[PDB]
Amino acid sequence: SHMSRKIRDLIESKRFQNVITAIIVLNGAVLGLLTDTTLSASSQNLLERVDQLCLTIFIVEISLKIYAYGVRGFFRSGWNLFDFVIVAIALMPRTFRIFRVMRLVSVIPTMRRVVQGMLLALPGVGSVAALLTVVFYIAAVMATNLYGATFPEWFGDLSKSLYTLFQVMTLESWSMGIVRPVMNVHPNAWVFFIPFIMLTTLTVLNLFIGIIVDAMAITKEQEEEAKTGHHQEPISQTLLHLGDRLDRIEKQLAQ
Amino acid sequence: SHMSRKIRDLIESKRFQNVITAIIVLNGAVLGLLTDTTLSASSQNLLERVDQLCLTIFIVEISLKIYAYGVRGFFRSGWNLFDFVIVAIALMPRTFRIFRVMRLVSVIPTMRRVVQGMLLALPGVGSVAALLTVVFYIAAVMATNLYGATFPEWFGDLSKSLYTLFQVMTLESWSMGIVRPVMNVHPNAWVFFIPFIMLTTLTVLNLFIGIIVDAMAITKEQEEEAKTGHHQEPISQTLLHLGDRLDRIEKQLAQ
Amino acid sequence: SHMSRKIRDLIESKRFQNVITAIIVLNGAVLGLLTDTTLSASSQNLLERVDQLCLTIFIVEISLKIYAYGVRGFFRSGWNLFDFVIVAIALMPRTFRIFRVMRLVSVIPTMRRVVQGMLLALPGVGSVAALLTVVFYIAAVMATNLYGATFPEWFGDLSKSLYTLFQVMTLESWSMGIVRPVMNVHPNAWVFFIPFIMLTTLTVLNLFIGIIVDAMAITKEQEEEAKTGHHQEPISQTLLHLGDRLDRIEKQLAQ
Amino acid sequence: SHMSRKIRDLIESKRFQNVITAIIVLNGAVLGLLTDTTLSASSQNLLERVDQLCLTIFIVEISLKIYAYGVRGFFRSGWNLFDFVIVAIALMPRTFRIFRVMRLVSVIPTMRRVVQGMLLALPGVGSVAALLTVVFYIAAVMATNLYGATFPEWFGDLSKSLYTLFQVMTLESWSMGIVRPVMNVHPNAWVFFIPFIMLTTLTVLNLFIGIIVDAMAITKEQEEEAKTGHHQEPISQTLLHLGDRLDRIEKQLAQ
Ligand SMILES: CCCCCCCCCC(=O)N(CCO)C[C@@H](O)[C@@H](O)[C@@H](O)[C@@H](O)CO
Ligand SMILES: CCCCCCCCCC(=O)N(CCO)C[C@@H](O)[C@@H](O)[C@@H](O)[C@@H](O)CO
Ligand SMILES: CCCCCCCCCC(=O)N(CCO)C[C@@H](O)[C@@H](O)[C@@H](O)[C@@H](O)CO
Ligand SMILES: CCCCCCCCCC(=O)N(CCO)C[C@@H](O)[C@@H](O)[C@@H](O)[C@@H](O)CO
Ligand SMILES: Nc1nc2ccc(OC(F)(F)F)cc2s1
Ligand SMILES: Nc1nc2ccc(OC(F)(F)F)cc2s1
Ligand SMILES: Nc1nc2ccc(OC(F)(F)F)cc2s1
Ligand SMILES: Nc1nc2ccc(OC(F)(F)F)cc2s1
Ligand SMILES: [Cl-]
Ligand SMILES: [Cl-]
Ligand SMILES: [Cl-]
Ligand SMILES: [Cl-]
Ligand SMILES: [Cl-]
Ligand SMILES: [Cl-]
Ligand SMILES: [Cl-]
Ligand SMILES: [Cl-]
Ligand code: NA
Numbered sequence A, B, C, D: 001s002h003m004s005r006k007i008r009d010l011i012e013s014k015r016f017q018n019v020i021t022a023i024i025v026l027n028g029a030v031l032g033l034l035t036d037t038t039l040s041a042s043s044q045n046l047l048e049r050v051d052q053l054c055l056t057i058f059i060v061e062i063s064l065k066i067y068a069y070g071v072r073g074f075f076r077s078g079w080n081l082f083d084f085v086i087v088a089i090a091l092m093p094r095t096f097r098i099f100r101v102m103r104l105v106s107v108i109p110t111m112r113r114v115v116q117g118m119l120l121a122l123p124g125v126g127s128v129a130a131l132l133t134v135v136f137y138i139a140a141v142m143a144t145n146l147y148g149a150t151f152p153e154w155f156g157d158l159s160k161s162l163y164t165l166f167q168v169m170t171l172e173s174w175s176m177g178i179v180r181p182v183m184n185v186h187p188n189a190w191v192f193f194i195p196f197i198m199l200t201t202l203t204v205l206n207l208f209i210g211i212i213v214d215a216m217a218i219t220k221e222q223e224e225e226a227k228t229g230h231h232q233e234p235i236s237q238t239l240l241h242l243g244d245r246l247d248r249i250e251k252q253l254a255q
């Protein structure tokens, strides 16, 4: 009965998605080729047109979408917003056009759900992250005061110290490159660095594991709802309802 | 009543498996000795005959098998196919004969099941892997543009950048060897590299954990079915059936 | 009806907490600025007053608290004790004032619960930690005896050996920096170092995983009790009570 | 009524255990002091007597034990056997006496149970370990053939290659120290090394996680049985028995 309705049906098809995916990939491949500094002037010119085309197909797509759903209903979705900004900002002649390839995530549903699970897991680890942040800040202040005068390249100011401490937490050359040189001047520096490592590696892995365990559960419920309209009821609710059926046959057997 | 049937019984015995295992090991040991560049001409000649023998015993084995199961029923199995190719390609006088030792996996059932679990887990992490791939590709394009002119050995082209970024994701000399040298020329490069590390280490570990958790469950169900013909019913189905027995005694107590 | 009661209500408000949080942050920011060695004499003087103020607001706070709860009831809490010491020791004109910023943990409840979970998990991994400790001590004695005379910088005495072995367990330059140089003199040293690595990396990760899995469960029960006054009953107790309702309807249907 | 019985009661007391623990620690402390190469002749002499004493107290202990339980019942226990060998071999005037300190594990029950869980978990990961072993062996043969002539220090023979590949699997200097130098001569060597890393890091972590998850469950059941004489019934058996109580009230309500 309606134009709008027939467009939404197009937008939401599997073929349309495949086509926009193919254009993202192509845009991506062309921006990759353009890294090649040896290119002829005409080749670069060509590739830049392919990019122009890709960007155009993107504006038609988003247009189609803002029409078929209306200004307020398109902007209802973070993903549409994201798609919109990514495409919009390219219409302002920043220099990292290649971020356009993140649209593979916004356009492919299973990929969107991976990202959604990870974003959704961030709140629940916020206290673990804050504890890490506090540990970092305190360590960076002490390292600057302790070591900044004698090791200024690594600890000369707070910024330097944070950088160095991040390197130390990743275990990268922590000993041969940082702590042994420091200990030649400050023999007890292991008393600072080895507890720092123990605590940050424990906390970071806590942070990581919390994100991953949650993100995987969220994603998995999203995949279920996407396929069947509902998710698995948690065992605890299943046992709750079993508790109810038991109450209703205990009460029924009064007489 | 049948030749075929008596051969299949041989093939499927525990003694036959032990014998083929022993020949794989021996083939493997001889290819190891042949790495020894100091060997006398006669020793090498000997070892090469032992390999020839090993390969022959393999053709008889596979023959036995294609006969006792017929062309279409042998080629029904990925493992038979794999065994077939590995042995076949050696009959074309590639240079990595040592891959023959992967037959330890195809011939030993518990080992086959480990590999089966890992292959079977690959689909379920395909979106996590694709997200990693996207992150890599985008990072490699930006690193080439940002750093290729000033650091061409590490970022001079897309290939270089991908390699370097893989090294960076593994945390290997990421700071003393790559990022500190880069920052002497581009002082804000930590703004690129430290988020890259955070995101890829999170995603890779997500990838790893997903594979392992699934592969372990799959393998474990395979080990159960191999031993008893069935696996453990998931708790959720057990609770489902408990829900059914409750319905049938709630309905029965109508009167 | 009471002063005490109206103060406790202030102390326990959300606004009061926000205010003490803001003062910790500010104290923290000022101690950070003071790392900056380039500061004018007047700037340093200013910042030191801001610290003096911050410390004062802290004494009023703790005073308020010891009054509104009484000496014995304030000192009932580890966190109050901790808050008390941190603030008290600053009234003794040690040099790491920046530890004051750990009060973000004692004053923010969700952060307190993260730390509480980790402390509470320590007992249950105490045997895994002791095993690691034993492995370290034995390794450090043997490394000193084996390698101390020929590699005294790394193994010259027990202290040196422990340090080196910690570095080796973290995998930092273990081979190019320590074990290959050692093997040029003692060709079988891989027989010591590679088992050391296998065993300590297995044990440390066991230690880490045990802490994290437990700390996460404890923290999560604390967050529940903080919000609703109780936690989730473990599935095992739920099944226990289900077993009871079954007994009471099996016994009831005697006649 | 019996000597034997009163000795076993002594052996099995908490005070006796504390005393043997204290002697292990002391033996351990003295062997540590003896690493100190600067010691006076008389100090070393003293410490060596303390060791002699410690070893003597150990023989009385084991004697007490072989008597109070009899030759066949003492040798029934792996831990007694282990205690016996450790003490016995010292009566043969090998040079790593410090292994005596592993008796802290055999004498302290919670520590014994950690080790027991890890030993008991080894069978269930045997296939994952064998797969790793196969991957290593094949990689080491190919690396020797590919790279041995041009990089003999790292790949000159099978032993060298295994060592290098272990280093590579731990990610230690894998790129700046091994693979970049190799690629200057063999530009496609990343095609060998990067898949090697992906596969071995996945497999090793699978190995590690399998050991730890199992060892923790085993240990935890052992701690339960040690305290209460039984362990927790697995949920699956609890649900089985719930299924039985349901059958017995479905069958009972026939009439
Ligand atoms: C977890 C958070 C880790 C964040 C680290 C912050 C980096 C500091 C940013 C900064 O402002 N810098 C100063 C210039 O803008 C660069 C520093 O990173 C510093 O390391 C350099 O000065 C080195 O090149 C000197 O050795
Ligand atoms: C996660 C995917 C990581 C994949 C990495 C791809 C490697 C690039 C393959 C390639 O085509 N190369 C060019 C020649 O074929 C070799 C490069 O690896 C490159 O690093 C070398 O040019 C260095 O030797 C220079 O410093
Ligand atoms: C898991 C526990 C790891 C703990 C490590 C203890 C460190 C030893 C403390 C000590 O007393 N030292 C001697 C001076 O006080 C410093 C040593 O750390 C040592 O490494 C130095 O002498 C090096 O600078 C020489 O190469
Ligand atoms: C996962 C299993 C990793 C096991 C590694 C086996 C080590 C090899 C033992 C051996 O027999 N060697 C030869 C002498 O006995 C020593 C080698 O380790 C070798 O690396 C040395 O020759 C280097 O010093 C040369 O660069
Ligand atoms: N693979 C490995 N990673 C680590 C990280 C830390 C560690 O010790 C510490 F105390 F830091 F946790 C040992 C190891 S082994
Ligand atoms: N053993 C350890 N591995 C890592 C890996 C990453 C890390 O920080 C990051 F933000 F990258 F995750 C810290 C650590 S400690
Ligand atoms: N990322 C990785 N960390 C490790 C730690 C240890 C290891 O081998 C060992 F035997 F030590 F466990 C391999 C790896 S891969
Ligand atoms: N902390 C980290 N350890 C690893 C180990 C391997 C890895 O990539 C690979 F493909 F090897 F798994 C990335 C990372 S990040
Ligand atoms: Cl770009
Ligand atoms: Cl010092
Ligand atoms: Cl070969
Ligand atoms: Cl810059
Ligand atoms: Cl300070
Ligand atoms: Cl040696
Ligand atoms: Cl010793
Ligand atoms: Cl090559
Ligand atoms: Na590492």
Ligand code: NA
Pocket: A171, A172, A173, B171, B172, B173, C171, C172, C173, D171, D172, D173
């Ligand atoms: Na490293």
Ligand code: NA
Pocket: A172, A173, B172, B173, C172, C173, D172, D173
């Ligand atoms: Na390194």
